[PDB]
Scaffold this active site. Structure first.
Site, PDB file in Angstrom:
ATOM      1  N   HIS F   5      -9.791 109.331   0.696  1.00 11.48           N
ATOM      2  CA  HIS F   5      -9.295 110.046   1.756  1.00 11.48           C
ATOM      3  C   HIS F   5      -9.162 109.204   3.172  1.00 11.48           C
ATOM      4  O   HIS F   5      -8.177 109.104   3.888  1.00 11.48           O
ATOM      5  CB  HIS F   5      -9.711 111.376   2.250  1.00 11.48           C
ATOM      6  CG  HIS F   5      -9.653 112.500   1.118  1.00 11.48           C
ATOM      7  ND1 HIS F   5     -10.757 112.541   0.132  1.00 11.48           N
ATOM      8  CD2 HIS F   5      -8.834 113.367   0.905  1.00 11.48           C
ATOM      9  CE1 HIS F   5     -10.273 113.407  -0.738  1.00 11.48           C
ATOM     10  NE2 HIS F   5      -9.306 114.067  -0.080  1.00 11.48           N
ATOM     11  N   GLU F  77     -17.471 109.916   1.856  1.00 10.96           N
ATOM     12  CA  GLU F  77     -16.831 108.744   2.086  1.00 10.96           C
ATOM     13  C   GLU F  77     -17.444 107.869   2.784  1.00 10.96           C
ATOM     14  O   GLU F  77     -17.683 106.252   2.490  1.00 10.96           O
ATOM     15  CB  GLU F  77     -15.377 108.759   2.148  1.00 10.96           C
ATOM     16  CG  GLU F  77     -14.810 109.837   0.913  1.00 10.96           C
ATOM     17  CD  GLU F  77     -13.155 109.982   0.590  1.00 10.96           C
ATOM     18  OE1 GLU F  77     -12.432 109.292   1.727  1.00 10.96           O
ATOM     19  OE2 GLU F  77     -12.800 110.903   0.022  1.00 10.96           O
ATOM     20  N   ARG F 165     -14.262 136.857  18.046  1.00 11.25           N
ATOM     21  CA  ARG F 165     -13.277 136.852  18.718  1.00 11.25           C
ATOM     22  C   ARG F 165     -12.312 137.876  18.341  1.00 11.25           C
ATOM     23  O   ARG F 165     -11.843 138.022  17.319  1.00 11.25           O
ATOM     24  CB  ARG F 165     -12.488 135.591  18.878  1.00 11.25           C
ATOM     25  CG  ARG F 165     -13.225 134.202  19.477  1.00 11.25           C
ATOM     26  CD  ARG F 165     -12.213 133.170  19.728  1.00 11.25           C
ATOM     27  NE  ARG F 165     -12.867 132.470  20.576  1.00 11.25           N
ATOM     28  CZ  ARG F 165     -13.904 131.490  20.612  1.00 11.25           C
ATOM     29  NH1 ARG F 165     -14.402 131.379  19.092  1.00 11.25           N
ATOM     30  NH2 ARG F 165     -14.144 130.677  21.531  1.00 11.25           N
ATOM     31  N   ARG F 220     -19.843 132.467  27.276  1.00 18.60           N
ATOM     32  CA  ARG F 220     -19.502 133.841  26.781  1.00 18.60           C
ATOM     33  C   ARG F 220     -20.083 134.842  27.483  1.00 18.60           C
ATOM     34  O   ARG F 220     -19.484 136.001  27.372  1.00 18.60           O
ATOM     35  CB  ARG F 220     -19.155 133.798  25.223  1.00 18.60           C
ATOM     36  CG  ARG F 220     -18.215 132.654  24.615  1.00 18.60           C
ATOM     37  CD  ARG F 220     -17.938 132.708  23.355  1.00 18.60           C
ATOM     38  NE  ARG F 220     -17.358 134.113  22.991  1.00 18.60           N
ATOM     39  CZ  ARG F 220     -17.424 134.571  21.708  1.00 18.60           C
ATOM     40  NH1 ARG F 220     -17.700 133.728  20.822  1.00 18.60           N
ATOM     41  NH2 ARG F 220     -16.864 135.580  21.494  1.00 18.60           N
TER      42      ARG F 220
END
Ligand SMILES: [K+]
Ligand SMILES: [K+]
Ligand SMILES: [K+]
Lengths: 250, 250, 250, 250, 250, 250
Positions: F5, F77, F165, F220
């Site tokens: 990848h 990887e 949310r 929050r």
């Protein structure tokens, strides 16, 4: 009918408070015909119900069908019609070498390999029999000289993969059930059947009494083809036991 | 010592095959005192062991400590020393309105709110008591006139959150346990304690017999503070019962 | 007493805010006797508590017992008496070939093979040590030249099947734990013990600080019978480490 | 009989490879009556089987009983007798406001609230219908002008608690199921029934084709009591659809 | 931007209601460039979005990134911008011997080996495709003469252990995934990929339509290194299929 | 390319063994710019890699993409290309009242609300950071005068429902996640993000070192909209910290 599935009204039970609950319709008649004044009340779906009389008291005999879902229907609807005690009787295959064909198993509690039990209690709750029902079944077995084992039963939602049968269409058992039978046998589990985890959990969690007895017709550790006479005899002994337990519980 | 934790040799047990197993070392001496020729064997960690004699047979009394992990060590090590039968005795708080202070509970099986049971059987396996031990305990209770309730106990790995106690440091109970007590009450569960899911699952899955009795010292649905005499007299009563049951199992 | 199990009052702690928590009563005395003004406060059940003084500040040493249930009691009740930091010390068996007997393990977090941890947080929550406690333990180890490994510990509710011991009554390990040790070893887990998953989860989820150190007395990949002197020495080094960590945390 | 439960031999099916599988024995006769040369084969337990002919090809109609366990037996045994395609037909209660009495539901896959599905695939595997069966059923429905909804069904091991019915003996639903109906409604689930999670999972994981259609007889969000003609006409309509779909799959 | 991640405003979509959603940015351009009036709208993070026009109607093409988490972001934010239908296209490795390189797979539902799907529905809910999306994809495949298989896909949160690749840094696969591929293959699962369990569950549970097609570039049961031309050709055929399905769904 | 990848060869890394791993390609360039001789290596999918030099040693900076699946590919990887140490840096929203905008969080371990972690270790295994990485990050933070909080992060496979949310397309959160935020707040969890449960579990179980730092851009519990300069200055600060920590780990 007063209920959705069984096709029974309240007054059909004539005040009965205890039901014997085999799986199959054909066994219902065999049980009722050992008591007095047997009458067929209904046959709808897998639910065949008779009434009879034990020492002058009405008793119901009602087939559950195979599996926890139909058992759960029959139990709920019989409970709405006043039954408070439920005794299951079956014939079964033992999975322990020391259990012989013709012996009688009384189940103290069941391994919950079903799904209906979860609709009444979370998996940690034990699928346990009522102690007066288990007492009466053991005493009833003794009352006819039966060889009795008292212990745990594995209760499966399938007859084939859940019980590790491989002589099937696919020949395959899913990984979680492959090698499970050996686990139950190492833990002392006596046998498999297909209704008790539901029956015992739903009654134990709902303040209903329940218990189970079965006669052994095959031993899967020393497997023989059963003889027709031996199966009839063992079935009749287990039927007498559950009826005699019924008599002690009324 | 023949074993890793308990400080016992095979010879110390003098061929005993039955053990009464309370949770705390102090109750070991109370139980051994009811029997003949009581002698202290060993005290290591939470494990206090005495031997005594009942109807001329040696019997062991060994404390488990609180919770399944220490219980699991005591049962395994006493099994390696030849114990085949284990009778737990405790005092407990009821969670049902109809149970009174001074009543006696005999446990047919337990809700597995513990972790050590999982080290012996997956969660679907019932934490079920041995039928002969349960019978001996109920008969013993009825023999001295106890008011006896027989049924399901919830067995918790904690004293505080898992029994929904909120007068604690945090005052918080984790979501999965918050409102769980009302679920067990609805399902007819009698009481909480902290060793039976392990004791019963491990014995049931290893071919050992176990059973449990307890005396009720508080009812959480109508909660009174107990005086010392209530607690002593309730403990005495359950202790008398468990010794009487041991007599019937020897 | 101000608490249900420990037999302690608030003023017995004399303002202490940190507790060293070994599993066994005998180790409690060994730790307290390395500090100043040691005094025994109580012995009830598995809970033996001493107080002592480190550079003029009161410290508590309190045995947890074996297993998460009793640990959870001792932690809750010490927290109600004002302890805010909890350091566990043990002796242990390593399961990695590169760890030698006499090395010291400081646990960053634990595999949760217990049940009590679930009564404080769901299984996804990490059984992680406080970073200042783990720092102080590593620094304390370095302060005496110990060979230190820092990493994950598997915390089991059983000593026998959960740790894949087969030299037992039944000789059996349940399927879910059979071959589990090889999984932990491939994942770099250093050792097993029996209290940390509970201790670390309940503190981390309740805003209490906790950490754990242990000395290695056996390596199960190269298993020798331990020498008495080596065990005493390794125990003493781990005891000095936890006390020296205590000093850095006050 | 070539099989353990259904009472059928291979010859009885006359080379049929498709079965329509309603839940109740009484509907078997209704379906077989639409086709040519209808003949009764067998009736044992909840398993009633007829054979008939469609476009010159033999087709089987066999009742499953209520719930996954009995369904699993019928499918396995009919597969050993050469059935490769299984079409379930039912009548059902909708749980969405936009679905009307008399509409037809074709199920693409089911919520697995059953236990027998687990005996064939772990829970992450989808209880998904065969695309050719689903296509044949939707096209058949559209062919006679049905109002058709195609989507997800919830498949429950109980009629009562798992479908959040509260007018029952206990009036209680266990915590995990209480408020579950509103979750399935929010997620666009069409309806509940009691056999498809097993039927679809077992067929999908064993290279058998299955699909399901149902006629709507009640809407629980705007609940009217149905008259007998509504129920008969809705059943007729779904029965016509399933036979028409069988025609396209032969 | 009107959304947190994608960098799109509502009016950028020009009223589009359907999105084609490949995993990678490079494939986005290849798809858009087969339609009319292609324009690049944004490239932020793994999210590359183009718009184009199919028979005069705006269509969006938007890369999801690898894995359910990023897929779930792209789907939510495209839905807030008015997309209601989502078609995934990929290239994939087959795991069944009868599937050839260059064949096309249309997914009816997915095994949920991911975590994001659980944030929209519990594991029992099926990761099932919309029937009109799956119809249009199968019809589109037929419209170009592709060899099409229709069935289940295993959707993994990892490329390496979750798909049982062992040529990795550690060479290890965790016990629960070791031998899982053989289970999926015995259950008829066609292939693995990494976004569909999330995509299909979140749409099916939120009243959005979704479906998936993929072209086969390798067969792991008969594994060859793919030829560059064959991969380009198979990719283009799957791209035409998903675009032609888009045309049928508008 | 040596790997599937990332588009990198072993030679491209020039013997680097440490990687800083932000989530987005754009931050890769910001980090590499702080170091010497920054050069772009590759950009494929969500994976953008630069190399630079720190104290004369080569160091890699590679973006993970959002979520555990893409993170798992990047770490595997880069491990095959010789990276042994991975430092994640992010910006984040706090969920505790005492944490301020501009403070820095270092994560000791994470709540596993992801799926890819399960592909490396069962859920009981802690998603725990390496002690040397955590120490380097806290010391680096304290070195530039940051206000630092060290503790538990919740690691979610979604941005929207799993972080509760509700201003979304559906406005719905699935039952298991609804009210979960208040549980993590009660338990002292600092923040949510979407890669660390995978990063930390996979590294901890494969003998790789990992750690994570983040700068707080929103709280929050007292939510203010951040301006661009707040976000840039918070990002700069965390980026300075992570490079300083890399310096201490080389
Ligand atoms: K049935
Ligand atoms: K203990
Ligand atoms: K991604």
């Amino acid at each position: 009918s007063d209920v959705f599935h069984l096709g029974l009204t309240k007054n059909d039970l004539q005040g009965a408070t205890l039901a014997i609950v085999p799986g199959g319709p054909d066994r219902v008649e065999k049980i009722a015909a050992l008591m007095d004044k047997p009458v067929k009340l209904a046959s709808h779906r897998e639910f065949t119900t008779w009434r009879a009389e034990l020492d002058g008291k009405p008793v119901i005999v009602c087939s559950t069908g195979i599996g926890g879902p139909s058992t759960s229907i029959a139990v709920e609807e019989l409970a709405q019609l006043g039954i408070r005690t439920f005794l299951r009787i079956g014939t079964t295959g033992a999975i322990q070498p020391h259990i012989n064909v013709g012996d009688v198993l009384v189940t103290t509690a069941s391994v919950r390999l079903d799904g209906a039990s979860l609709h009444f209690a979370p998996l940690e709750f034990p699928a346990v029999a009522d102690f007066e029902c288990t007492t009466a079944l053991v005493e009833a077995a003794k009352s006819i000289g039966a060889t009795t084992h008292v212990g745990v039963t594995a209760s499966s939602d399938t007859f084939y993969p859940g019980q590790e049968r491989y002589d099937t269409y696919s020949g395959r058992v899913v990984r979680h059930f492959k090698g499970s039978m050996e686990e139950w046998q190492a833990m002392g589990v006596m046998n498999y059947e297909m209704e008790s985890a539901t029956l015992l959990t739903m009654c134990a969690s709902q303040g209903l009494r329940a218990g189970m007895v079965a006669g052994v017709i095959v031993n899967r550790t020393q497997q023989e083809i059963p003889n027709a006479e031996t199966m009839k005899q063992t079935e009749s002994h287990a039927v007498k036991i559950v009826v005699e337990a019924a008599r002690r519980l009324l």
